[PDB]
């Protein structure tokens with residue numbers, strides 16, 4: 428909407444106060460004009476018709492329980508925009524400052540979040556498996572990263588290409604979580620998963636097997652559930668990424684860690700310059716090796732560690 432840029436204040440899903448960029452025109456709208464061609468957050472009002480209505484508020488204060496998922500979807504989309512722009516020189520998900528749109532309060536009891544081809548969508552959860560999913564910065568960044576993937580490598584959402592697609596979203600979700608630097612970890616979704624159980628998460632990148640996901644190619648899932656295991660076999664690539672960054676010895680193979688920033692540079696370059704819609708795990712290894720070679724040189728530690736990490740997870 429046309430209006431003037433304003434700054435509201437509110438509370439997110441976990442009860443924390445934050446400022447949000449809004450727009451005033453009769454109402455205050457969740458429309459942040461400070462980033463690209465805007466970040467826009469919508470109320471889906473417990474229905475499934477998208478996007479719903481641009482979020483309107485009478486007083487620019489967002490402290491109601493119903494407001495909390497909107498506050499976080501809006502704010503964490505901004506953090507994710509900032510990560511891609513400041514760290515990777517990428518302007519929004521399309522590289523051309525496309526408007527970023529999110530809807531919250533999608534459906535009833537909906538234990539998921541997704542990119543629908545055009546926008547982000549967040550359930551409220553059922554209160555048992557999830558609370559409103561936009562409360563997780565790693566979740567928000569996971570969803571926006573699907574849009575980045577779709578505009579770049581275009582990885583098809585099935586089998587190995589789909590597991591790479593998933594891992595890319597977990598990797599950058601985690602790197603955004605570290606960028607914001609509030610309780611960062613290598614776990615996925617911990618801030619919104621199972622409010623009655625402490626210390627768990629939906630997936631682990633440091634130890635995927637903690638939640639039944641494979642940590643070696645020999646343990647990959649080969650069936651048809653979950654689009655051929657896209658959220659399962661992502662563990663193999665998540666583990667490789669974790670090892671590149673943090674190091675470790677895994678199934679007897681030692682990896683010298685090179686840190687998060689270099690992980691992110693290598694995988695961003697692989698995603699945007701080398702991967703294709705049908706890339707498999709072996710082709711990802713090759714893309715990561717080439718990316719590290721471009722950035723750091725063929726004889727570098729970074730290249731050697733990429734090879735070590737893929738060896739450790741059984742990907743040649």
Ligand SMILES: CC(C)C[C@H](NP(=O)(O)CNC(=O)OCc1ccccc1)C(=O)N[C@@H](CCN)C(=O)O
Pocket residue numbers: 538539540541542543544560565566569570573584615616629653658
């Ligand atoms: C990070 C966590 C919290 C959420 C994440 N969701 P996602 O990966 O982005 C789900 N996207 C998806 O399916 O896209 C395909 C699609 C959909 C609509 C239009 C076009 C293409 C996830 O891991 N979900 C799991 C667990 C959900 N309980 C799961 O779906 O099995």
Ligand SMILES: [Ca+2]
Pocket residue numbers: 484485486487488489490
């Ligand atoms: Ca208000």
Ligand SMILES: [Ca+2]
Pocket residue numbers: 604609610611612617618
């Ligand atoms: Ca965390």
Ligand SMILES: [Ca+2]
Pocket residue numbers: 565601604611612613614615616617
């Ligand atoms: Ca996390």
Ligand SMILES: [Ca+2]
Pocket residue numbers: 617620621622623624625626627628
């Ligand atoms: Ca929990």
Ligand SMILES: [Zn+2]
Pocket residue numbers: 569573593596
């Ligand atoms: Zn995903």
